């Protein structure tokens, strides 16, 4: 097995890594081994004096606090967002733009960004007067909680992978991570896309032709949108991966609707197993959310993302062709 796993980890720099095979081959530890691989690949253990055993201990505890009984928002999803972010960090239009602290902030943010997700939406948790929504006053309920858990687990035994950062490093990292995770709230998609379009309209390059980011506001905005794109990258992946991500999100929404049934609440969109239209939902999802976002990202990093935009469009075509 470990030879086969090691073989698959050779694709970690590739869009469309078989994240599901890696989950099998690593014994349901995709998040731990893809993070480990990426930290070695970016030489982050030595840059930040992260002890290897501390890194593994933390990664396994983090992976544990993703719910294995949740169909979509589990550790496989987290592994895939970490790995997609890692590919997007390497894009040529971003070369040498981001410090190693920002690279670590982004990768860390991706890893924790959905931890302890209960498999239901913010709105469901607001609507059922959950403790989470009560704790967080109905605003970015899950995303605040993923942050709260991601950081808290650093305090478990031999889990503080940031123990050797400077105090100023930790401070900057923490703020960047919060700023990134809070931006994965889907209720902020339109605004984040709006601001990203504005950045593309006013884009500035360097003498190297690489993107020019003067200040925290612009730099965190690019990392926010990057991890957001990675979060919304399932329909840009090879169709065999895309389809399995759809099967998983559909099952999670369907389970939520059932909970909405046993409560007399109305069923949210796309959550009713007796009134589903999965293909048309994917096409609408691509047309109104996913393709607008990625087209904008593609203009930002043009032409670095063309093959990704290609696959999205092919996949969009294909989901259309299966519509009755
Ligand atoms: C609050 O904002 C929304 O409700 C909005 C976002 C989105 O719902 C989501 C969230 O609120 C928060 C996180 C997520 C992730 C996905 C998602 C992921 C993959 C999908 O299909 C494929 F890519 F695998 C997917 O399909 C969307 C759909 C059926 C209509 C949704 O949808 C999410 C649809 N409506
Ligand atoms: Mg989320
Ligand atoms: Zn996510």
Curated annotation (Swiss-Prot):
Zn(2+) 2 binds at residue 114. Changing residue 174 to D: Abolishes homodimerization. It comes from the Eukaryota. Residues 1-324 form the PDEase domain. Long isoforms that share a conserved PKA phosphorylation site in the N-terminus are activated by PKA through phosphorylation. Isoform 3 and isoform 7 are activated by phosphorylation (in vitro), but not isoform 6. Expressed in colonic epithelial cells (at protein level). Widespread; most abundant in skeletal muscle. Zn(2+) 1 binds at residues 77, 113-114, 231. Mg(2+) binds at residue 114. Coiled coil: none annotated. 3',5'-cyclic AMP binds at residues 73, 282, 285. It is found in: Apical cell membrane; Cytoplasm; Membrane; Cytoplasm, Cytoskeleton. Mn(2+) binds at residue 114. AMP binds at residues 73, 114, 231, 234, 282, 285. Hydrolyzes the second messenger cAMP, which is a key regulator of many important physiological processes. It is linked to Genetic variations in PDE4D might be associated with susceptibility to stroke. PubMed:17006457 states that association with stroke has to be considered with caution. Homodimer for the long isoforms. Isoforms with truncated N-termini are monomeric. Isoform 3 is part of a ternary complex containing PRKAR2A, PRKAR2B and AKAP9. Interacts with PDE4DIP. Identified in a complex composed of RYR1, PDE4D, PKA, FKBP1A and protein phosphatase 1 (PP1). Isoform 5, isoform N3 and isoform 12 bind RACK1 via their unique N-terminus. Binds ARRB2. Interacts (via N-terminal region) with SHANK2 (via proline-rich region); the interaction is increased in a PKA-dependent manner. Belongs to the cyclic nucleotide phosphodiesterase family. PDE4 subfamily. This is 3',5'-cyclic-AMP phosphodiesterase 4D. The gene is PDE4D. The chain holds residues 390 to 713 of 809 of the full protein.
């Amino acid at each position: 097995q470990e030879d086969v796993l090691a073989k698959e980890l050779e694709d970690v720099n590739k869009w469309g890594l078989h994240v599901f095979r890696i989950a099998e081959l690593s014994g349901n530890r995709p998040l731990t081994v893809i993070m480990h691989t990426i930290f070695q690949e970016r030489d982050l253990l030595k840059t930040f004096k992260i002890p290897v055993d501390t890194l593994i201990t933390y990664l396994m505890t983090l992976e544990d606090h993703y719910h294995a009984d949740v169909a979509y928002h589990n550790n496989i999803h987290a592994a895939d967002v970490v790995q997609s972010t890692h590919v997007l960090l390497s894009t040529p239009a971003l070369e040498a733009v981001f410090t190693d602290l920002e690279i670590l902030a982004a990768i860390f943010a991706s890893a924790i960004h959905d931890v302890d997700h209960p498999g239901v939406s913010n709105q469901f948790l607001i609507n059922t007067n959950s403790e989470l929504a009560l704790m967080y006053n109905d605003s970015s309920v899950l995303e605040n909680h993923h942050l709260a858990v991601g950081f808290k687990l650093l305090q478990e035994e031999n889990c503080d992978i940031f123990q050797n950062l400077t105090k100023k490093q930790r401070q900057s990292l923490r703020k960047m991570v919060i700023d990134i995770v809070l931006a994965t709230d889907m209720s902020k998609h339109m605004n984040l896309l709006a601001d990203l379009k504005t950045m593309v309209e006013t884009k500035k390059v360097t003498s190297s032709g690489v993107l020019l980011l003067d200040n925290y506001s612009d730099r965190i905005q690019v990392l926010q949108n990057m991890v957001h794109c990675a979060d919304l990258s399932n329909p840009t992946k090879p169709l065999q991966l895309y389809r399995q991500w759809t099967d998983r999100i559909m099952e999670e929404f369907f389970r939520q609707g059932d909970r909405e049934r046993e409560r007399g609440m109305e069923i949210s969109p796309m959550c009713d197993k007796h009134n589903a239209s999965v293909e048309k939902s994917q096409v609408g999802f691509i047309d109104y959310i996913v393709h607008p976002l990625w087209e904008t990202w593609a203009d930002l990093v043009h032409p670095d993302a063309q093959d990704i935009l290609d696959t999205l469009e092919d996949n969009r075509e294909w989901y259309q062709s299966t519509i009755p």
